Amino acid sequence: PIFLNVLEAIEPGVVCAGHDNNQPDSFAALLSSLNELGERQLVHVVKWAKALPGFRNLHVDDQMAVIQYSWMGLMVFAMGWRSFTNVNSRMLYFAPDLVFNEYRMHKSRMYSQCVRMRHLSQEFGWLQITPQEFLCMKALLLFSIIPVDGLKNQKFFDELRMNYIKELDRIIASCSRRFYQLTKLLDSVQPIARELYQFTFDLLIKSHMVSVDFPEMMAEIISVQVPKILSGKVKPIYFHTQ
């Protein structure tokens, strides 16, 4: 199984946030650490994406675009998986040094979003999602959000997305019920990512008033790319009608 071999081989390892767990929880400390974690994970997501089967078939502009649109969903989905495998979804396992209990969910001012992420984590358990299903689903998330007006070479993207869908189907191969379930789960990531994009955009704009630090790439992406999503110029590709 060449395709699964590759997904297993390229899967990123552990990423720490650099959070100081000796200091009391505060909104500014928790969010600054999540932002730094995003910056660190972005590096891993780029290295991973560039090594995916067929990724280099895309126009280079589109390679960069899909990463910059899909990172939130990719990272949330992976975090939900870590939470499921590490703490049975009892907490949000952002990183080994940044685990959210209910108190942190509250103090982050992101409780509603955290609730939804924890629900996503629980779904991995409720659906008995396999590691191989997780890997295929996560790869497909990279190819699940594009400009309404299309990419630089839409044809190459369409073909690549088609093949990742096929790879997910073959790993499934009850099969119809399963595929329906997994595509529903995939769709569910996108509204969660949208809420997080709105939250982080609003936070960036007022960051100087709440002492929240945004690293360089996060600040750029959140001000340059994320607004395309929030303004409706870039939209998720849903399997099912919402």
Binding site: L42, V43, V46, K47, K50, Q63, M64, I67, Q68, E216, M217, E220, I221
Partner: peptide, 10 residues
Amino acid sequence: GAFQNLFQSV
């Protein structure tokens, strides 16, 4: 240019 710089740096 920060993301692009990362992307090209591998």
